[PDB]
Structure 1
Amino acid sequence: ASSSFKAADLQLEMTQKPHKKPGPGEPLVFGKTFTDHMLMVEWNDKGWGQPRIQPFQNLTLHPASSSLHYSLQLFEGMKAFKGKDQQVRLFRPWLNMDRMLRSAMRLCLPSFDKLELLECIRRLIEVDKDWVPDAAGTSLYVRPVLIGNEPSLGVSQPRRALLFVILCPVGAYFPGGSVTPVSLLADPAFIRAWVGGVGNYKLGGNYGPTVLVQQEALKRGCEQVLWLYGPDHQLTEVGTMNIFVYWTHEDGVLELVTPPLNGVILPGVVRQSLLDMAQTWGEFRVVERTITMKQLLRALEEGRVREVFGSGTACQVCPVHRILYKDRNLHIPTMENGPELILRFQKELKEIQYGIRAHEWMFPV
């Protein structure tokens, strides 16, 4: 096949049926509202077809499409922010393209040029730029997707695939102005991923099984799930966010710790940014190490825990105030210790993402 698709061959098809732009009491609910256009690229045995920006529209799929029978599907999630200047910028897009390609290979889906995809994405955002909000805390969510599309019930490498990208204006989850903490359910019975599995890839298959578990967290009074793994009940992730703990460890050294990338953790872009940032300050120890409930419990009643939070594109730095472990509620002093670290992290990202401070992390328009 010919290399992979190119931004120079983009075909533009403008919408004739514009969508009404969010205008109510400004109620932006994540993943519900879509912009006017979308990216679409098809892959055959002839290889990749020409990239196309077209009006948002339904997909037409053969009933035996492997994307629907054997979960040959993966996705990404990243944000575009509009600064006061009106300039739109994407936050570390390159990392998302890297991760997306890794996912593609894991599922035997067609490789592509990451810089070519980023360009097409840039062109798509340009076309729908008017959908990018600028109110404090708002942004545009970009959702690239790659699916196998073989008209065959055989479980095998697809010879046809489909890559598309859709956009959603978002208004930052819920609290709006403040930063309210969440409570978590920690029950060892629920398993999200395993060593040797595919938890470290953003594949649709990893999420479907969590819907029921999340419902159990609600019916139990919690807002999200703290995923535990292993006999030692290590803390892997929170909902769909990586987890960080800021405390003074056993050796009495103050540190920021987050589980290591050993197969069951999704390598979050925000996660990597927080480590990079904290490592740059050089004010305290920053490490990737397994974290156990045992260590947490001991640390809690020894008054060593300062802040616990999740990190992810949807909720950059999310405070945790309660963890329901063994029928036992554990209060997490995050807010008591002014979320000092959380607050500094949030300030820094805000400055970087909205262009207040120039940074290599931001990708123009």
Structure 2
Amino acid sequence: SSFKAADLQLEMTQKPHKKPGPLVFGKTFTDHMLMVEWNDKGWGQPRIQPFQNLTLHPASSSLHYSLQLFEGMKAFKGKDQQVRLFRPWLNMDRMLRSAMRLCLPSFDKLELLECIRRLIEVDKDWVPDAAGTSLYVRPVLIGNEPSLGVSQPTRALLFVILCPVGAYGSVTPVSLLADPAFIRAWVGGVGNYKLGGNYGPTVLVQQEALKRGCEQVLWLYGPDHQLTEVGTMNIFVYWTHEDGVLELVTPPLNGVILPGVVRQSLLDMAQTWGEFRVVERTITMKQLLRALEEGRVREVFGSGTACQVCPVHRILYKDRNLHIPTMENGPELILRFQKELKEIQYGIRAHEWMFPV
């Protein structure tokens, strides 16, 4: 029933744009896009087409009832000009889970991956090769039922667009607002899926953080103020735990955590090293407060595709500014992660995580 890469239709652009000569994340797009339509006849043939507007019926359920989901992954170009995607199978898996949660049509993950490979191959010259640059890949699946009844759509659109990017200077630390009034996601909810509806409501919360002199939001959960995420990034703490053991901890996948690809990759790398405990456990502000008083915290940071690994130096909680000594500790773990990831992403070391285009 899935659309097939074997049926890919291609229309080259006749309005090719000049590439960037200052890359602002997510604002510059390449010449082509993928588009696939689904209706009562199933999936149509996939097509690579020139970058262009979507035409939607004004009642489209994508716009009224948020039948929408997305992905985000990067492709990187090595010195030899070979382009490789970073662990894209995980994004495909996550995308399909999102689709099922929103009653959107199923597709074949490898068929989509091949279509995306073909699209990036067409726009290969858009993938920059300067240090710290990449191509951001944005798949999207939206419902497209022209009806105001809240219902499973009988029509949908799957499309993929591409953006050359730089950093989002990838080792500049940030300050976080930690206010329990704002709740990103709830157990039994959809916070662990990459659905559009999870993001729009955060915009005002981010504005409030800025107003309070902070740069990003630390999302707290539950009566014990668990640290869940930071902005649109997973949170990690490298510390000596209350039992005396040095560990890297991140919250477990209990429903309010988006299971990041970078997150998983950091756990995977640190487990492979075998040099300290690597654990998924709830982290509370009580534990962090005590650990900071007792000098046991080394580094705190967010993980995610767009910004990679970002250090945190301050947390504002219950009107008090908590200094986080991440930069004082190197930040050694952060720098090590960034170096090993860069070697893999740009092909300095062969690795099964990279998917060649």
Q: By the TM > 0.5 criterion, same fold?
A: yes
Report the CA distance between 1:11 and its aligned residue.
Answer: 0.5
Report the CA distance between 1:223 and its aligned residue.
Answer: 0.7
Runs of 4+ in 1 over 3 A off after TM superposition: none
Q: Is the 8 A contact 2:67 2:143 kept in 1?
A: yes
Distance 1:37 1:338 in 2: 42
Distance 1:58 1:312 in 2: 28
Q: Is the 8 A contact 2:238 2:247 kept in 1?
A: yes
Report the CA distance between 1:106 and its aligned residue.
Answer: 0.2
* 1:212-237 CA distance string (max 9 Å, x none): 00001111111100000100000000
Report the CA distance between 1:292 and its aligned residue.
Answer: 0.3
Give 2:136's match in structure 1, choosing from 137, 141, 147: 141
Secondary structure (helix, strand or coil) at the match of 1:64 reads: coil
Tell me which moved more, 14-23 or 292-301. Answer: 14-23
Report the CA distance between 1:172 and its aligned residue.
Answer: 1.3
Distance 1:23 1:316 in 2: 24
Report the CA distance between 1:41 and its aligned residue.
Answer: 0.1
Distance 2:333 2:18 in 1: 40
Distance 1:259 1:318 in 2: 17
* 1:129-174 CA distance string (max 9 Å, x none): 111011100000000000000011110100000000000000111x
Report the CA distance between 1:23 and its aligned residue.
Answer: 1.5
Secondary structure (helix, strand or coil) at the match of 2:287 reads: helix
* 1:190-248 CA distance string (max 9 Å, x none): 10000000000000000000000000111111110000010000000000000000000
* 1:88-109 CA distance string (max 9 Å, x none): 0000000000000000000000
Structure 1 gap segments, 5+ residues each: none
Report the CA distance between 1:329 and its aligned residue.
Answer: 0.5
Distance 2:146 2:14 in 1: 32
Distance 1:247 1:47 in 2: 51
Q: How many residues align?
A: 357
Give 1:65's match in structure 2, choosing from 51, 57, 60: 60
Distance verdict in 2 for CA 1:344–1:304, change over 3 Å: same
Report the CA distance between 1:270 and its aligned residue.
Answer: 0.2
Secondary structure (helix, strand or coil) at the match of 1:336 reads: helix
Report the CA distance between 1:178 and its aligned residue.
Answer: 5.7
Distance 2:345 2:193 in 1: 25
Report the CA distance between 1:315 and its aligned residue.
Answer: 1.1
Report the CA distance between 1:87 and its aligned residue.
Answer: 0.4
Report the CA distance between 1:338 and its aligned residue.
Answer: 0.8
Secondary structure (helix, strand or coil) at the match of 1:318 reads: strand
Paired-residue identity, %: 100
Report the CA distance between 1:19 and its aligned residue.
Answer: 1.3
Q: Is the 8 A contact 2:24 2:165 kept in 1?
A: yes
* 1:62-100 CA distance string (max 9 Å, x none): 000000000000000000000001000000000000000
Distance 2:199 2:171 in 1: 26
Distance 1:23 1:135 in 2: 12
Report whether the alignment pairs 1:119 with 2:114.
yes
Q: Tell me what 1:77 maps to.
A: 72
Q: Is the 8 A contact 2:170 2:307 kept in 1?
A: no
Structure 2 gap segments, 5+ residues each: none
What is the TM-score with the length of structure 2 in the denominator?
A: 0.99
Distance verdict in 2 for CA 1:60–1:178, change over 3 Å: closer
Q: CA RMSD in A?
A: 0.7
Distance 1:183 1:204 in 2: 25
What is the TM-score with the length of structure 1 in the denominator?
A: 0.97
Q: Tell me what 2:15 maps to.
A: 17
Report the CA distance between 1:358 and its aligned residue.
Answer: 0.1
Distance 2:156 2:171 in 1: 41
Report the CA distance between 1:45 and its aligned residue.
Answer: 1.1
Report the CA distance between 1:20 and its aligned residue.
Answer: 1.8
Q: Is the 8 A contact 2:9 2:45 kept in 1?
A: yes
Distance 1:277 1:155 in 2: 44
Q: Is the 8 A contact 2:176 2:215 kept in 1?
A: yes
Q: Is the 8 A contact 2:98 2:194 kept in 1?
A: yes
Secondary structure (helix, strand or coil) at the match of 1:74 reads: strand
Q: Is the 8 A contact 2:69 2:142 kept in 1?
A: yes
Secondary structure (helix, strand or coil) at the match of 1:343 reads: helix
